[PDB]
């Protein structure tokens, strides 16, 4: 399973290489609406549930649902190379995605379907995108090993930053728009100040490669997965590993937190996803 | 206590005094000896 | 005009300058950033601006006294 | 850190030598520098508002 | 009155006798019960001995230790010069992954050389190689007088 | 009964003119209509800086704290330290010492620790080559602001070292009638505890806006690494227009803050410099109080300096009224003949002051 | 007045901190100057 989405507390999702957008619940665990799309890698909900936006390594971008028939809209050759990740905004009307034809493009939900409005060129194959939960700024991760932060009312190139010595592959932004978290494949995440871009702790764990970092959206604490079957979570004031979790067996590809209390679900290479909750 | 502090202060000011005095005496030595040897070279020819 | 306008005690300074036409804050005054940037998108108005020893000392002080008298 | 303490007989730390010498040099050090900076002037701000 | 004051070192086969005043001592017998000393043949460390008299005192002061200790040999003994006052401490340590952590044990003092005679201890007719000059009018202006 | 003043307006100029002229001063109702009335902490620490740099000057404050009676002593100067409080950076303390300085007994070697610079007040490089060349034109020779540790807006911790060592007898009189032909447009951009690319994103935008001109543009870059970086991130930009043929300067500066894009900050300081260099004649508008105080403590003769009709506004009015209440010198305002540019020539007869604290 | 010699150097926590980081930097270099078997 390549990616996980999760709603408030009820429905959950798994995204794989065949297109099995499996729709789950934490109480009966049967995959509700199984269908088939293709080599899908990243995805997101629509904020009321019941509607799922999802990309692919082919040139496409597709949208599905829960209740009615599965395929509703798809845009083929939306990016003529592979795309990597996508995001709704803080409200759920725009749709930003980045793609390794050095393009990041927006979309608008209109009525059932989507509508492209604005392309942006970058000087590198972009491979990650994260938009703030208050639409204050977006951040993009480029393999020429940099992180660029743009605004959203203007997209006027707020902060270009660097320092990871390998392609950074996961970004997150603080819940109250004060601190970003960049994470690369050199086992060293960086908590980054926001007003000018001062690094605070370029700290180091997960001794092969960070694959995805995500933010516990209540306080400013955060979970970080590995590639070597360990998921930790850290606090953002003293920067110590307040918990390790060793309970996978292979490459933990993805994870996602749930916004009710920081209720997290992780997913690995060994076809296992599992649920972590409070004590 | 005040013994130690005033004695290191006195040695410090004495060393800086030696530095200042030596500096002005050799700059007045060399900067004037340049034109002194120039005028002696100009005089001893003629 | 403007000399007695300054040195008259009664009137306030801004009423003085509007009749003619807080310094702990050091910074000089300024207008709207967008306004003067849009005014000076072209800046060729500023193109008009852009592009023996004893008798020496006596001449210096006597020319000083002469220009002192000539503007007295 | 067992030598900046000192013990005694039993029925232990009567007082810390290093920290005692630290404060006992610091307060008279700032007193000496205050006497230097305030020895030979006349103009003084009166006590407070 | 119980405070030691003179430490006379005499390398008595017709050798030099140095004499040291010995100012601020601390005795582990009247502070700390922590066990025995380590008693390994130690390493030695010396801080800014650069004068010719400094080389002489470090020669006659380190030629009384066991020759050629090993790498594992734990305790280090320091002789630090802080303005003609050889401060002596001695420590044991281990190597942490972060670095090194020392453990103060045994005596501590500081000694100032005040005579260094070429004869042996008993004679008092010994020709003085060096002794300090307390009453010159430039006593407190230099080191190793 | 002797010299009375209202309010904390031009307060630094009132106290520095009292201690230059040697006349006792008394200022009351320092924001007396306020919930926190009286003297603020930065100006009380400023007054005790004055007391550290002079000798015999007594200062008394009322129990209200809004009335200050000041007798002046003599300016001894010398070498001392001074921590400045975090309510106000080092510029607000150094810019009156910059024209109290060169007359004292000893050399000025005084170091300021605290916040380097902020928005409303003067930057260190700003005062360095926007006000030390005008001091070199008025007569001093050896003056420097050794910036040996930068600071930051919210935490500071920086260290400057004002050192002047040209104890001039009195400032020479000034003669400037021509508008200066601006030869070079230089500047620096400083950064503390940030990425170095912020500097390039400043400079390319600023010289992009000013690149449509025949003038030689030259802006330099400095980051501060190590413990010379202060204790908080911050970055600023300053530009001077330097006229080398006689040595005049105009300048403009600003420091970014949370969300300040370096491109638009470079554009803002470029347009602010163009505002100053179009609005000002023969001297900077911010250099103007130093200019008139050196012209008024010049020799017993007249000195003449060009300003334009824009220079006369409320700060200049309260300056000239301050000097007319302190040592009663009318400034004569001639008009220049060519009315294409409505310029006044200010002629000021300097009070015959000499420094009276020199071991001779 | 004036005095003959510098007094006894009193042992403060600052001077024992400088002596301890001296010796721990020295043995982090492992530059101890002992004798040799020769």
Swiss-Prot record, chain B:
Source taxonomy: Eukaryota, Fungi, Dikarya, Ascomycota, Saccharomycotina
Query: Bias category Basic and acidic residues: which stretches?
Result: 33-46
Family the entry assigns: Belongs to the NOP14 family.
Name the gene: NOP14
According to its UniProt entry, the function of this protein is described as: Involved in nucleolar processing of pre-18S ribosomal RNA. Has a role in the nuclear export of 40S pre-ribosomal subunit to the cytoplasm.
Compartment(s) of residence:
Nucleus, Nucleolus
Q: What is this protein called?
A: Nucleolar complex protein 14
Q: How does it assemble?
A: Interacts with snoRNA U3. Interacts with EMG1, MPP10 and NOC4. Component of the ribosomal small subunit (SSU) processome composed of at least 40 protein subunits and snoRNA U3.
Q: Where is this region: Disordered?
A: 28-46
The organism is Saccharomyces cerevisiae (strain ATCC 204508 / S288c)
- Per the record, the domain of life is Eukaryota
Curated annotation (Swiss-Prot), chain C:
The highest taxon in the source lineage is: Eukaryota
Subcellular location(s): the record lists: Cytoplasm; Nucleus, Nucleolus
This chain's function reads: GTPase required for synthesis of 40S ribosomal subunits and for processing the 35S pre-rRNA at sites A0, A1, and A2. Controls access of pre-ribosomal RNA intermediates to RCL1 during ribosome biogenesis by binding of RCL1 in a GTP-dependent manner and, via its affinity to U3 snoRNA, delivering it to pre-ribosomes. GTP-binding and/or GTP hydrolysis may induce conformational rearrangements within the BMS1-RCL1 complex allowing the interaction of RCL1 with its RNA substrate. Required for RCL1 import into the nucleus.
> Subunit structure, per the record?
Interacts directly with RCL1 and the U3 snoRNA to form a stable subcomplex. Component of the 90S small subunit processome also known as 90S pre-ribosome that consists of the 35S pre-rRNA, early-associating ribosomal proteins most of which are part of the small ribosomal subunit, the U3 snoRNA and associated proteins.
Query: Family assignment?
Result: Belongs to the TRAFAC class translation factor GTPase superfamily. Bms1-like GTPase family. BMS1 subfamily.
What is the name attached to this protein's record?
A: Ribosome biogenesis protein BMS1
Natural source organism: Saccharomyces cerevisiae (strain ATCC 204508 / S288c)
Q: What is the lineage of its organism?
A: Eukaryota, Fungi, Dikarya, Ascomycota, Saccharomycotina
What gene is this protein translated from?
A: BMS1
Part of the full-length chain shown: 548 to 769 of 1183
UniProtKB/Swiss-Prot annotation, chain D:
Report the superkingdom from the record: Eukaryota
Protein location: Nucleus, Nucleolus
Q: Where is this region: Disordered?
A: 8-28
What is said about its interaction partners and assembly? Interacts with snoRNA U3. Interacts with EMG1, MPP10 and NOC4. Component of the ribosomal small subunit (SSU) processome composed of at least 40 protein subunits and snoRNA U3.
* Family indicated by similarity: Belongs to the NOP14 family.
What's the stated role of this polypeptide?
Answer: Involved in nucleolar processing of pre-18S ribosomal RNA. Has a role in the nuclear export of 40S pre-ribosomal subunit to the cytoplasm.
For this entry, the protein name equals: Nucleolar complex protein 14
- Organism listed in the record: Saccharomyces cerevisiae (strain ATCC 204508 / S288c) (Baker's yeast)
From Swiss-Prot, chain F:
Query: Any idea which UniProt keywords this protein has?
Result: Acetylation, Nucleus, Ribosome biogenesis
BP GO terms, sorted: endonucleolytic cleavage in 5'-ETS of tricistronic rRNA transcript (SSU-rRNA, 5.8S rRNA, LSU-rRNA); endonucleolytic cleavage in ITS1 to separate SSU-rRNA from 5.8S rRNA and LSU-rRNA from tricistronic rRNA transcript (SSU-rRNA, 5.8S rRNA, LSU-rRNA); endonucleolytic cleavage of tricistronic rRNA transcript (SSU-rRNA, 5.8S rRNA, LSU-rRNA); endonucleolytic cleavage to generate mature 5'-end of SSU-rRNA from (SSU-rRNA, 5.8S rRNA, LSU-rRNA); maturation of SSU-rRNA; regulation of rRNA processing; ribosomal small subunit biogenesis; rRNA processing
Q: Which CDD domains match?
A: RNA_Cyclase_Class_I
Cellular-component GO terms for this entry = 90S preribosome; nucleolus; nucleoplasm; small-subunit processome
The Gene Ontology terms for molecular function here are: enzyme activator activity; RNA endonuclease activity
Give the matching Pfam families. RTC, RTC_insert
Q: Where in the cell is it found?
A: Nucleus, Nucleolus
Superkingdom field = Eukaryota
Question: Which Gene3D superfamilies does the record match to this protein?
Answer: RNA 3'-terminal phosphate cyclase domain (3.65.10.20), RNA 3'-terminal phosphate cyclase, insert domain (3.30.360.20)
InterPro entries hit by this protein: RNA3'-term_phos_cycl_insert, RNA3'_phos_cyclase_dom, RNA3'_phos_cyclase_dom_sf, RNA3'_term_phos_cyc, RNA3'_term_phos_cyc_type_2, RNA3'_term_phos_cycl-like_CS, RNA3'P_cycl/enolpyr_Trfase_a/b, RPTC_insert
What family is reported? Belongs to the RNA 3'-terminal cyclase family. Type 2 subfamily.
Q: What else is known?
A: Present with 10000 molecules/cell in log phase SD medium.
The name on file for this protein is rRNA processing protein RCL1
Gene name, per UniProt, is RCL1
């Amino acid at each position: 399973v390549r990616s996980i989405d999760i709603s408030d507390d009820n429905k959950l999702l798994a995204t794989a290489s065949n297109g099995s957008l499996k729709i789950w619940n934490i109480k009966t665990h049967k995959c509700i609406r199984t269908f088939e799309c293709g080599y899908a890698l990243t995805c997101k909900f629509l904020p009321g549930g019941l509607l799922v936006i999802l990309g692919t390594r082919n040139g496409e971008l597709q949208l599905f649902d829960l209740a009615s028939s599965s395929l509703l809209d798809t845009i083929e050759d939306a990016h003529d190379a592979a795309i990597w990740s996508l995001d709704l905004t803080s409200d759920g009307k725009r749709l930003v995605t980045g793609s390794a034809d050095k393009t990041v493009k927006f979309w608008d939900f209109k009525v059932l379907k989507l509508h492209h409005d604005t392309t942006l060129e970058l000087t590198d194959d972009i491979l990650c995108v994260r938009v703030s939960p208050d639409d204050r700024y977006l951040a993009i991760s480029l393999l020429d090993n940099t992180v660029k932060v743009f605004f959203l009312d203007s997209m006027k190139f707020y902060l270009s930053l660097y320092g990871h010595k390998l392609p950074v592959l996961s970004i997150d932004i603080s819940f109250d728009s004060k601190m970003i978290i960049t994470s690369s494949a050199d086992k060293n995440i960086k908590i980054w100040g926001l007003d000018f871009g001062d690094c605070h702790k370029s700290l180091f764990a997960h001794q092969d490669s960070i694959m995805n970092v995500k933010f516990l959206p209540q306080s400013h604490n955060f979970f970080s997965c590995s590639k070597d079957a360990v998921v930790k979570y850290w606090d953002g004031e003293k920067f110590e590993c307040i918990q390790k979790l060793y309970a996978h067996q292979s490459e933990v590809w993805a994870l996602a937190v749930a916004t009710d209390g920081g209720f997290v679900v992780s997913s690995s290479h060994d076809h296992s996803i599992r649920i972590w909750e409070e004590t | 206590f005040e013994a130690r502090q005033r004695i290191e202060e006195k040695n410090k000011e004495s060393s800086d005094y030696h530095a200042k005095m030596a500096h002005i005496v050799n700059t007045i030595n060399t900067e004037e000896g340049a034109e002194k040897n120039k005028y002696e070279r100009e005089r001893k020819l003629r | 005009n403007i000399g007695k306008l300054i040195y008259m005690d009664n009137i306030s300074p801004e009423e003085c300058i509007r009749r003619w036409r807080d310094l702990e804050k050091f910074v000089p005054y300024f207008d709207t950033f967008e306004k003067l940037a849009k005014k000076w998108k072209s800046v060729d108005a500023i193109k008009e601006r852009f592009l023996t020893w004893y008798e020496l000392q006596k001449a210096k002080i006597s020319k000083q006294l002469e220009i002192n008298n000539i503007e007295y | 850190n067992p030598f900046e303490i000192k013990a005694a007989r039993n029925k232990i730390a009567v007082g810390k030598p290093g920290i005692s010498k630290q404060i006992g040099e610091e307060q008279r050090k700032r007193a000496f520098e205050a006497r230097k900076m305030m020895k030979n002037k006349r103009g003084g701000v009166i006590d407070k508002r | 009155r119980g405070v030691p004051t003179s430490l006379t070192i005499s390398h008595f086969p017709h050798g030099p006798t140095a004499q040291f005043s010995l100012h601020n001592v601390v005795m582990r017998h009247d502070i700390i019960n922590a066990g025995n000393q380590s008693e390994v043949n130690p390493h030695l460390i010396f801080d800014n001995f650069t004068t010719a008299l400094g080389k002489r005192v470090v020669c006659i002061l380190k030629h009384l230790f066991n020759a050629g200790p090993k790498k594992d040999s734990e305790r280090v003994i320091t002789f630090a010069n802080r303005g003609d006052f050889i401060s002596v401490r001695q420590h044991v340590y281990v190597r942490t992954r972060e670095g090194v952590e020392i453990a103060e044990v045994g005596p501590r003092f500081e000694m100032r050389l005040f005579e260094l005679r070429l004869g042996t201890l008993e004679n008092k007719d010994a020709d003085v190689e060096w002794q300090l000059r307390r009453f010159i009018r430039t006593a407190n202006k230099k080191d190793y007088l | 009964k002797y010299t009375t003043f209202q309010g904390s307006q031009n307060f630094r100029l009132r106290i520095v003119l009292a201690t230059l002229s040697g006349k006792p001063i008394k200022i009351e109702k320092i924001r007396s209509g306020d919930l926190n009335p009286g003297l603020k902490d930065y100006e009380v620490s400023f007054l005790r800086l004055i007391e550290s740099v002079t000798n015999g000057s007594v200062i008394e404050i009322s129990y209200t704290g809004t009335t200050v009676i000041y007798r002046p002593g003599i300016i001894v100067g010398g070498a001392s330290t001074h921590i400045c409080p975090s309510s106000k950076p080092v510029g607000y303390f150094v810019e009156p010492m910059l024209y109290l300085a060169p007359f004292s007994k000893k050399k000025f070697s005084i170091l300021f620790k605290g916040i380097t610079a902020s928005h409303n007040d003067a930057g260190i490089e700003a005062i360095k080559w926007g006000l030390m060349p005008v001091m070199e034109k008025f007569g001093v020779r050896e003056c420097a602001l050794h910036t040996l540790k930068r600071g930051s807006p919210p935490l500071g911790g920086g260290e400057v070292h004002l050192v002047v060592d040209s104890l001039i007898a009195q400032p020479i009189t000034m003669h400037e009638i021509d508008r200066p032909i601006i030869s070079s447009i230089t500047g620096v951009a400083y950064s503390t505890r940030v990425s170095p690319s912020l500097v390039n994103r400043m400079i390319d935008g600023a010289k992009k806006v000013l690149k449509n001109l025949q003038c030689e543009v030259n802006i330099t870059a400095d980051v501060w690494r190590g413990e010379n970086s202060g204790k908080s991130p911050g970055w600023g930009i300053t530009l001077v227009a330097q006229s080398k043929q006689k040595g005049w300067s105009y300048f403009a500066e600003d420091i970014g803050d949370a969300g300040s894009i370096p491109e638009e900050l470079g554009e803002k300081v470029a347009c602010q410099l163009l505002e100053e260099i179009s609005k000002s004649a023969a001297v900077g508008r911010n250099q103007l109080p130093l200019a008139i105080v050196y012209m008024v403590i010049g020799k017993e003769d007249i000195g003449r300096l060009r300003i334009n009709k824009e220079q006369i506004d409320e700060r200049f009015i309260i300056l000239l009224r301050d000097i007319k209440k302190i040592f009663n010198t009318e400034v004569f305002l001639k008009p220049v003949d060519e009315a294409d540019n409505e310029d006044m020539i200010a002629t000021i007869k300097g009070i015959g002051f000499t420094n009276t604290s020199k071991k001779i | 007045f004036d005095r003959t010699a510098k007094p006894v150097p009193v042992i403060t926590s600052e001077v024992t901190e400088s002596l301890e980081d001296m010796i721990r930097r020295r043995i982090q270099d492992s530059n101890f100057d002992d004798l040799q078997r020769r």
